[PDB]
Design an enzyme around this catalytic site. Sequence first.
Site, PDB file in Angstrom:
ATOM      1  N   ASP A  35       0.823  -1.200   0.000  1.00 40.00           N
ATOM      2  CA  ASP A  35       0.000   0.000   0.000  1.00 40.00           C
ATOM      3  C   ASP A  35       0.865   1.261   0.000  1.00 40.00           C
ATOM      4  OD1 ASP A  35      -1.941   1.899   0.292  1.00 40.00           O
ATOM      5  OD2 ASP A  35      -2.414   1.412   2.392  1.00 40.00           O
ATOM      6  N   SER A 199      -0.740  15.587 -12.079  1.00 40.56           N
ATOM      7  CA  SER A 199      -0.994  15.226 -13.464  1.00 40.56           C
ATOM      8  C   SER A 199      -1.246  16.491 -14.284  1.00 40.56           C
ATOM      9  CB  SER A 199      -2.185  14.269 -13.531  1.00 40.56           C
ATOM     10  OG  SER A 199      -2.603  14.020 -14.862  1.00 40.56           O
TER      11      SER A 199
END
Length: 330
Positions: A35, A199
């Site tokens: 994770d 992004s």
Amino acid sequence: STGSATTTPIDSLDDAYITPVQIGTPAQTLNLDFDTGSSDLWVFSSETTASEVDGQTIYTPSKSTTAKLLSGATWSISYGDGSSSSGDVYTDTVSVGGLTVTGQAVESAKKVSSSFTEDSTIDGLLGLAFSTLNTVSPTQQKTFFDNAKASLDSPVFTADLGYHAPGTYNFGFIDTTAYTGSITYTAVSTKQGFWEWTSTGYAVGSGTFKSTSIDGIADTGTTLLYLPATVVSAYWAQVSGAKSSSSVGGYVFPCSATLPSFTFGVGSARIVIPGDYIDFGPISTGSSSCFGGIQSSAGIGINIFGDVALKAAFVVFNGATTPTLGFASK
């Protein structure tokens, strides 16, 4: 040193991925959920409340000659999906894919929430976010990667998750045969303890690319892709009959649909998520309503590039002095 381990979907939907991890002496192999959005290595154990164990493999520290109680240390964690666990702490030898760390904090669960109990395939979590998020008190502990880092050939790990197939976690090297083209690197902020990056935009299907900054986290422990409501609405508007259902808890679509791809930007590069990766199947057995793999982050407080996004790429988690993230197509 290096390590290399195969990671395998837990079910036919890729709801999560498990990776075998050797703990203790002699080794006890547990299948852990790696994770990159948390920083605790915790396991089902001989200390876990018996009624909360249902099929998991447990770690038994009393059977490990290298286990030592970390006296006074406790831990307690709550995850974004509302699940939680807590307990006490041992140090022991932990190996992943041939890479060994001695003195790793292994957090033994005394209590786990129902979603953990109900998932027989996940024996615990191995956190790979920054150690500043580790929950051990009163002395915070380091992640497996942080402990291994100095010994690694290069201070990196990579995630290569499969779509409905196994993939690979590598530590200490970049497998140049595992991706196509070049790797595009992008800046990371560690201010919130995550692999947080920005992004450069998105496209839906064959549509034009929208240049827009989307701050979010690369999180292997989250199944879906969670993005701003504007972006998510633009995606689902291209699927006839798709709608957001408050009763179901997100966007659903007719199972008869063919889903468009979703592209996200990494600098000037582009990663394309095929439409099939966005199908999470019937909302309940036999239903013709299917659950979407792109959902709104509104009210999470952060955008999450979870498995839906990451499995479309070869992803480099570069833990150099100034960390960065790399993405390549594959």
